[PDB]
């Protein structure tokens, strides 16, 4: 029949189940980022590990290898585009120098907090899922939406959102109209 539609996982549970050293660290990382569960940490961990795995192969190659070049720079350009790699850190060695904290800093939930549109990091996720923040002219309600460098400056309240010049919401209309 029809050709199969491929799919793949985005996370991986750690081998050792209960280790308070890891258990507290994951709580610490998510707690200050307001992440919903550990899957959002298992997702960052798995997704970052494959970025290293791509870089690890190229460093075994001899330099000026055009696969090591073309693939190496193509990977780096994507990372600097979203800001996880600093603009002065384009050596494919700093890609190994990355940590989970780097890309979680690039999230929509993180950045709306640091742009001050919500008082707290958990209030930052609330502004997202309740459809209030528009990036560019497209409303995004994905907490994990990674923001590129050019998309960094275009995050603001949705124009139809009650906090952004739109009409009042359900509660205000019912009360102000009561």
């Amino acid at each position: 029949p029809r050709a199969p539609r491929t799919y793949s996982k985005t996370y991986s549970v750690p081998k050792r189940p209960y280790e308070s050293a890891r258990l507290d660290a994951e709580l610490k990382l998510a707690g200050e980022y307001g992440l919903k569960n550990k899957r959002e940490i298992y997702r960052i961990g798995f997704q970052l590990s494959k970025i290293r795995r791509a870089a690890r192969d190229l460093l075994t190659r001899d330099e000026k290898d055009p696969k090591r070049l073309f693939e190496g720079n193509a990977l780096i350009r994507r990372l600097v585009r979203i800001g996880v790699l600093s603009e002065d850190k384009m050596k494919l060695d700093y890609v190994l120098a990355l940590k989970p904290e780097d890309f979680l800093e690039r999230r929509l939930q993180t950045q709306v907090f640091k742009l001050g549109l919500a008082r707290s990091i958990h209030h930052a996720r609330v502004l997202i899922t309740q459809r209030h923040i528009a990036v560019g002219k497209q409303i995004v309600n994905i907490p994990s939406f990674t923001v590129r460098l050019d998309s960094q400056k275009h995050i603001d309240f949705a124009h139809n959102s009650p906090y952004g010049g739109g009409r009042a919401g359900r509660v205000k209309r019912k009360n102000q109209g009561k």
């Binding site: 709580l27 998510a30 707690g31 200050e32 992440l35 958990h122």
Partner: protein, 56 residues
Amino acid sequence: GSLARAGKVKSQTPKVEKQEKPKKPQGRAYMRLLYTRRFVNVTLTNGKRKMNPSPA
């Protein structure tokens, strides 16, 4: 052996109705609820930290 004693203990356990309690937060809030109580308002006994200390 004889099968007469099966279920002897649970039968003679006095019934206790669970006390009705407020519901706990779910989602990120329980994630938020724990993060404060474990890393922010510490209740360690000056390096002695127990998670479910029974009364004594």
